[PDB]
Amino acid sequence: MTDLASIAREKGIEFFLISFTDLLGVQRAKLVPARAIADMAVNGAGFAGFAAWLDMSPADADILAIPDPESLIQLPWKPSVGWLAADVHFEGRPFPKAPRVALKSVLARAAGKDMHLKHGVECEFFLIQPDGSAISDPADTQAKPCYDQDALMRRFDVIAEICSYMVDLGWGPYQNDHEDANGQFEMNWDYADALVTADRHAFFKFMVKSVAERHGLRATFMPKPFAHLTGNGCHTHLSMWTAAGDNLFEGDGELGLSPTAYAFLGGLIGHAKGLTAVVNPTVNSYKRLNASPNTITYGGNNRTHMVRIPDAGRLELRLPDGAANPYLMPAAILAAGLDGIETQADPGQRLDIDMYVEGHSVEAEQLPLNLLDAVRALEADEVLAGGLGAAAAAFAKFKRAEWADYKSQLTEWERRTTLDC
Amino acid sequence: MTDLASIAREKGIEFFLISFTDLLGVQRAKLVPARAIADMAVNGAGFAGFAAWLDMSPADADILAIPDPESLIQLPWKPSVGWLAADVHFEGRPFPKAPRVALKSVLARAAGKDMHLKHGVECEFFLIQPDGSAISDPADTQAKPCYDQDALMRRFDVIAEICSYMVDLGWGPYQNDHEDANGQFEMNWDYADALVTADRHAFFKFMVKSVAERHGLRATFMPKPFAHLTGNGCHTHLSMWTAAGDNLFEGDGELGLSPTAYAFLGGLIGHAKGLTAVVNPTVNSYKRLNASPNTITYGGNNRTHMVRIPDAGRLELRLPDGAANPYLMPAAILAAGLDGIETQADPGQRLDIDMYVEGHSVEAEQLPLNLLDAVRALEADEVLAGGLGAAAAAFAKFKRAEWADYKSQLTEWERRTTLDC
Amino acid sequence: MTDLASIAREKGIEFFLISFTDLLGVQRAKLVPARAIADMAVNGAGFAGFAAWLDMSPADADILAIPDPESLIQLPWKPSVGWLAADVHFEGRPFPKAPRVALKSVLARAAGKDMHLKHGVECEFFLIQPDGSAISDPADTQAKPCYDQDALMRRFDVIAEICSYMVDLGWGPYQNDHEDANGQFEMNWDYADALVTADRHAFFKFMVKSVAERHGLRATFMPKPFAHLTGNGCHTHLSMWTAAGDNLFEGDGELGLSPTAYAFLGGLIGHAKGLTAVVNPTVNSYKRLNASPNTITYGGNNRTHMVRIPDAGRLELRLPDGAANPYLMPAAILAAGLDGIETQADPGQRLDIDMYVEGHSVEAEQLPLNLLDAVRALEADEVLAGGLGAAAAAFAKFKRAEWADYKSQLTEWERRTTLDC
Ligand SMILES: Nc1ncnc2c1ncn2[C@@H]1O[C@H](COP(=O)(O)OP(=O)(O)O)[C@@H](O)[C@H]1O
Ligand SMILES: Nc1ncnc2c1ncn2[C@@H]1O[C@H](COP(=O)(O)OP(=O)(O)O)[C@@H](O)[C@H]1O
Ligand SMILES: Nc1ncnc2c1ncn2[C@@H]1O[C@H](COP(=O)(O)OP(=O)(O)O)[C@@H](O)[C@H]1O
């Protein structure tokens, strides 16, 4: 790996965006001219951490975001700018409250046991009007819009541009779909080592929002952006691999899954409640859990349970939504899963039923149904909090304030239903 | 007591409003011509209970609301109509889920022990525009509007009319004030036997709303109707009396209070959390508990604690808000208090401090901070649920549905704070 | 077979639209980058079938749409994209509820008797404003607009573009007409093997809609889109052929038709009622049957009957409308016809009269006059239902639901005519 300064000269990069993800998933970046990249690659870009979602004080020394040169992406729509993901450092060490640092820590524990997490994300999003008031396509109106050829091709320019970028970047994109809400789309690409996928997922949201804007549109990954439409998931596909390239999840047990997979699964099931706080991290998230289908079960090739087993050597957690932190969520999933493996956790019986029809009759534990309860579940889950380190309590702090902020709002519903009390 | 038919002939009453209060405090009434009052006074007015907030089925027999002839009030603004409060009966017996029946049951238990609850209510309300969008007086704007002579006299017509009605009805009204929010008023009258006060409180809200409408205005008892203004309380004054006319609360202990009073108080303190669900019964209610001042303490002549001791032989519960059921709330207070007396409950130390300044430093139990948590507190409080009978679980059911209804609403705050997640 | 990956390289195709038609005729497609076509061509593109009109559950495994490489069409207006028609497979076999699969089944039965159905379609459509409120040409206004030269040429650019595409695609287009309603047009091309014509029919609607949109206009195949104008037919021309290449309908009987042709006709007459549900598949469809001409008769070179004999070796079914599924329609027609042939059905006497003038005096069976009755007829016709397989029952299920949805709408007619009852 050559230096970024030399790459800048060779590939015509004039500015670098040195970037990191805070606790709320917000992309924080600094635009640095190429003349300054050498110093910053080694010493890091200085940011006042208290000004981001990092649970820091104005009295603290500036954090130093150290770029991972392997993450470099020349913006495909603006190649004279080089994007870099970074680890936030504080007082000479990675700062445990930064999502990407948290993720790297859990990975290092799994890696030490020769277990390498790989995942793929299904990042649904909506294409909407710039003012956010409606979807971008007024002609996308029918009751079952999923895979609608007409509406898909009406947004060919934006979708095709983005997919072609992903081809060039080497993500191995393989399908673009219109999803089951009007105005909603999904663009899939190959799974990879968790850190690779996490970096891609963070960049992907930024690319989609950016390219949409250039087309006079807007993209949102909001969990439930419209009252009358279903929402955005981020269903996650999970497998564990040895450094020698074998999928520990492949086995001769049920459905081609191994004991390791089922123990991992058992951690997922066992830690589902606190896990919800992290993978459904906003007040808005909880609308998708109250629509009925809010219990903890799996699985099989069945898109009706919290966990689906799509094929051999693979689990799909169907819990995370569009707001899920690209680093915190694989981190939290891995912590729960690793615990499952170590404790030989038992997932219980696979249910081969349609939960939307027969779910009412199944005795199952229930997920937390609002942000506050979910945070409480996270705080009571010591194994999970310990797996995320200091990030967990900082996350719980912020979400509790969001909760109180939300509840303090005077809504129309309140006035409509209470004015005559 | 003569018959209502004979009174109708003598006082020129052409219609009776036979009325009862459901679990949400909603006044349900039927307008019956005088020719039919005799049968209904004895047999009751038939209502389909499932259509009110009574937790009933369409398959149930109609309830029979039996008028309390002693409650009769010729509408002062329309004397040809006679208003009556009623006990809802079902299958030949008072229906334990009806608020007024619940209240009468608790009273009968206290009465059996020669303890007679008397209370006064401070029913603050706002005078607002008919469309509810702003207060009725655009010139009522200053930062400290409390007792504002100008704004008070600007609403003299409406206030004076209502107070004069209360004089004629024999309620012993003694003061009308502009309260500490712009547009907010209060009109006090003498305390009385709980059932008398409860009937008056129910009628009072109706009279104020009715008279406001006749003046082209509107009244609301909503807890927190405006984002920028403080809200409506219903602080309640409480004492217990023997049939021989002695105030059991008067004594030689601290502040002129007796051991009975302090044990009653101890029930209040001891049952405060579940009590909150009943006396802060709406989602909206909880805004007033998050503004800081949400802990459980008393007292002294100090408007800064959950309980104030204004004078000898008197407790003021400063907890209830404008949405409090006129029957359920004295009922719930009495259940908690009676328990305190029977268990010789200990309130702990009176705090002679200003909670708004030093509250942060006091170790005290905290009230529930949202409707859901408050309902949970009610459900966990067996003594309190048992004291209200079947009304308690029916109340909890409805409020839980209100909670889920509220949370399902897509708010602007959500879109503003999450669209860019 | 030069593979799709190879064809993509040489033809410069960057994306494929893998498409299938659902039970409501809706085009469902996935946009796949060339780099992924090889795998999808072999294994199929995955779709959640419950999200389309296929009568499935979210608990079902995804269907796999397997593309027919012989259907490949480079979109003539956007040749970097390659459209493919696909067969829906479920759990390792063709999904009988998918129209194209159902059609292929019926064709295989017939093929097994050396009878190969060939058909051509007259897919009338309107050109309208994007908002759908009026036709595209405000100057197209005369009482008898059929074949209007001015209006035809006023839309030359769009019509000519589409026709030239059909020339290049090898469909053998031969005429473009302005039809007998203002704003209505028709573009004819050579008949072919049923499956070829079906795929083309499906693609054609998409082409016309897409090209219209590129010209700032819009196309609709809605059966009756305007209250004041006549509607869109999809009249179908039908013949049966041996593999040797002879037209089984050509014979010595009347009008140059054979006994086989007449028995086929007899199946059409015999199953006309049930057939109506499939080829008039919407509530809106039934307007064209209540506008008189709704009895079951043929024929001769006479456009006044349900079936017309245009010439030797050919039958024209004048029943299907613009909403007819391009796959279900020929399938249902073939099912009926084959039965006619197997049972030696007697079509009755040819009526050489004008049904518009003398039709009232003829004794003939009447077609069903609304969607509900038509569905009932489909369900009662077990020979027809059995011939379409599971597609029939799923179709009827959806249509019964559409019917209930329609009836549940509060129409202005209802209010105008009932408000004063
Ligand atoms: N063994 C695996 N481990 C982790 N992720 C995987 C694995 N296999 C596939 N994926 C990823 O899961 C995501 C979804 O894949 P997909 O084949 O579309 O699943 P499905 O057919 O169930 O919808 C993709 O990003 C994909 O690359
Ligand atoms: N001994 C009592 N028991 C119950 N309520 C009382 C008692 N004495 C007064 N009240 C009532 O309490 C309410 C408030 O009285 P008020 O004298 O204005 O109290 P404060 O001075 O503390 O504001 C009135 O309705 C009043 O009649
Ligand atoms: N023998 C046949 N079998 C099936 N379809 C046919 C046959 N001959 C013609 N067609 C198709 O029927 C459609 C109508 O043909 P056309 O010549 O316009 O007849 P008409 O003048 O009666 O409308 C055309 O699309 C044509 O391809």
PDB file of C-alpha atoms in Angstrom, chain C residues 116-122 174-175 186 188-192 235-241 246-266 268 298-303 306-318 333 350:
ATOM      1  CA  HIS C 116     -50.627 -25.641 -32.245  1.00  0.00           C
ATOM      2  CA  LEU C 117     -52.575 -22.487 -31.388  1.00  0.00           C
ATOM      3  CA  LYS C 118     -51.615 -19.319 -33.227  1.00  0.00           C
ATOM      4  CA  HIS C 119     -53.154 -15.962 -32.457  1.00  0.00           C
ATOM      5  CA  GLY C 120     -52.969 -12.260 -33.156  1.00  0.00           C
ATOM      6  CA  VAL C 121     -54.254  -9.485 -30.917  1.00  0.00           C
ATOM      7  CA  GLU C 122     -55.919  -6.180 -31.661  1.00  0.00           C
ATOM      8  CA  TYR C 174     -48.655  -3.791 -41.150  1.00  0.00           C
ATOM      9  CA  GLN C 175     -51.068  -1.020 -40.099  1.00  0.00           C
ATOM     10  CA  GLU C 186     -54.545   0.527 -32.760  1.00  0.00           C
ATOM     11  CA  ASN C 188     -51.468  -4.416 -35.726  1.00  0.00           C
ATOM     12  CA  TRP C 189     -48.730  -6.977 -36.338  1.00  0.00           C
ATOM     13  CA  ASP C 190     -48.489 -10.569 -37.667  1.00  0.00           C
ATOM     14  CA  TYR C 191     -50.042 -13.432 -35.742  1.00  0.00           C
ATOM     15  CA  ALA C 192     -47.712 -16.131 -34.429  1.00  0.00           C
ATOM     16  CA  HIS C 235     -60.183  -8.769 -30.216  1.00  0.00           C
ATOM     17  CA  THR C 236     -58.311 -12.023 -30.822  1.00  0.00           C
ATOM     18  CA  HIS C 237     -57.786 -13.970 -34.038  1.00  0.00           C
ATOM     19  CA  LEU C 238     -57.332 -17.695 -33.689  1.00  0.00           C
ATOM     20  CA  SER C 239     -56.227 -20.698 -35.735  1.00  0.00           C
ATOM     21  CA  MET C 240     -54.849 -24.203 -35.007  1.00  0.00           C
ATOM     22  CA  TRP C 241     -51.959 -25.703 -36.966  1.00  0.00           C
ATOM     23  CA  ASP C 246     -51.145 -26.932 -42.106  1.00  0.00           C
ATOM     24  CA  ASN C 247     -54.042 -24.859 -40.797  1.00  0.00           C
ATOM     25  CA  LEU C 248     -56.530 -27.264 -39.172  1.00  0.00           C
ATOM     26  CA  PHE C 249     -59.246 -24.576 -39.381  1.00  0.00           C
ATOM     27  CA  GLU C 250     -59.137 -24.527 -43.207  1.00  0.00           C
ATOM     28  CA  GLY C 251     -61.755 -26.898 -44.624  1.00  0.00           C
ATOM     29  CA  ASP C 252     -64.662 -27.665 -46.940  1.00  0.00           C
ATOM     30  CA  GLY C 253     -67.504 -26.822 -44.570  1.00  0.00           C
ATOM     31  CA  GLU C 254     -69.262 -23.457 -44.637  1.00  0.00           C
ATOM     32  CA  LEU C 255     -67.201 -20.285 -45.159  1.00  0.00           C
ATOM     33  CA  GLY C 256     -64.051 -22.314 -45.782  1.00  0.00           C
ATOM     34  CA  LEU C 257     -63.925 -23.705 -42.250  1.00  0.00           C
ATOM     35  CA  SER C 258     -63.362 -27.305 -41.222  1.00  0.00           C
ATOM     36  CA  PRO C 259     -65.228 -29.509 -38.720  1.00  0.00           C
ATOM     37  CA  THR C 260     -62.324 -28.998 -36.330  1.00  0.00           C
ATOM     38  CA  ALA C 261     -62.749 -25.229 -36.556  1.00  0.00           C
ATOM     39  CA  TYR C 262     -66.481 -25.518 -35.912  1.00  0.00           C
ATOM     40  CA  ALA C 263     -66.039 -27.803 -32.918  1.00  0.00           C
ATOM     41  CA  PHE C 264     -63.486 -25.283 -31.541  1.00  0.00           C
ATOM     42  CA  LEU C 265     -66.084 -22.582 -32.084  1.00  0.00           C
ATOM     43  CA  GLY C 266     -68.594 -24.743 -30.231  1.00  0.00           C
ATOM     44  CA  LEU C 268     -66.129 -20.987 -27.369  1.00  0.00           C
ATOM     45  CA  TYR C 298     -71.628 -16.117 -34.246  1.00  0.00           C
ATOM     46  CA  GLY C 299     -70.665 -15.228 -36.950  1.00  0.00           C
ATOM     47  CA  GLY C 300     -69.665 -14.861 -40.587  1.00  0.00           C
ATOM     48  CA  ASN C 301     -67.653 -11.866 -41.801  1.00  0.00           C
ATOM     49  CA  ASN C 302     -69.721  -9.804 -39.401  1.00  0.00           C
ATOM     50  CA  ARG C 303     -68.491  -7.580 -36.550  1.00  0.00           C
ATOM     51  CA  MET C 306     -69.340 -12.556 -30.051  1.00  0.00           C
ATOM     52  CA  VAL C 307     -67.488 -14.633 -32.636  1.00  0.00           C
ATOM     53  CA  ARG C 308     -66.774 -13.526 -36.185  1.00  0.00           C
ATOM     54  CA  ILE C 309     -65.532 -15.570 -39.141  1.00  0.00           C
ATOM     55  CA  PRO C 310     -63.313 -13.126 -41.045  1.00  0.00           C
ATOM     56  CA  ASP C 311     -62.115 -15.552 -43.667  1.00  0.00           C
ATOM     57  CA  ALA C 312     -61.306 -19.225 -44.188  1.00  0.00           C
ATOM     58  CA  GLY C 313     -59.028 -20.825 -41.595  1.00  0.00           C
ATOM     59  CA  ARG C 314     -59.655 -18.250 -38.871  1.00  0.00           C
ATOM     60  CA  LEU C 315     -61.983 -17.352 -35.992  1.00  0.00           C
ATOM     61  CA  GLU C 316     -62.151 -13.939 -34.329  1.00  0.00           C
ATOM     62  CA  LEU C 317     -63.178 -13.837 -30.683  1.00  0.00           C
ATOM     63  CA  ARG C 318     -64.620 -10.359 -30.203  1.00  0.00           C
ATOM     64  CA  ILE C 333     -59.564 -19.588 -24.987  1.00  0.00           C
ATOM     65  CA  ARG C 350     -74.517 -19.042 -37.952  1.00  0.00           C
TER      66      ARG C 350
END
